[PDB]
Amino acid sequence: SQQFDPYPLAMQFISQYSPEDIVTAQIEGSSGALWRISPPSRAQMKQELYNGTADITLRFTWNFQRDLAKGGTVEYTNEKHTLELAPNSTARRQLAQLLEGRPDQSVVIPHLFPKYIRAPNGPEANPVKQLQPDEEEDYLGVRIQLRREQVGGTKASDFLEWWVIELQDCKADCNLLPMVIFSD
């Protein structure tokens, strides 16, 4: 409340909810599983990401499962944020470079991670419209990176890959992404 105290709309919204009704989801960034993709589909990914003409989509989807024993009908509340990538833009070219196997390359996708989400009793977990008035510039940026691990021969399929994402502006909890959600 202190952080969002100057703003009137935000203050009324937060005041509406009880303190024991809002939860922070400490989703891990680096603690993922191996990226499993067939070598033909990965090669096609890289080729389409380089020499593509149509814009390529990139979506970030959240999905909350809530206990059904507490009443209520809908049991999953999900929603996606879709970001487009125009051909030959800086981000798409950067990703095509990222898949090349560079040791410490990184990419930054601006405005992709909506920090404050609302989970109503319906199947629409829309990001809070109020706490993020801009609705496109208030979304946090995300730094995506690809990690390799040699095993062992074909070059690109020769070794393990996984993906690590972290928040754009991270100081000490870089291996963690918070996500505050208000549940009615």
């Binding site: 409340s1 202190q2 105290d5 203050m11 005041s15």
Partner: protein
């Protein structure tokens, strides 16, 4: 007694109105925004 009471009430409200008093800190007031039993609100000395 009506005239004296209303005069005393207006002056007392004016004196309490000042922000230096602890009740008024912009934090206590904000959290106690619609709670009906805040002590100044019940006594009528709350600042608006």
């Amino acid at each position: 007694t009506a005239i004296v009471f209303t005069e005393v009430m207006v002056v007392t409200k004016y004196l309490f109105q000042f922000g230096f008093f602890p009740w008024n800190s912009y934090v206590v007031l904000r959290r106690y925004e619609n709670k009906p039993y805040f002590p100044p609100r019940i006594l009528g000395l709350e600042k608006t």
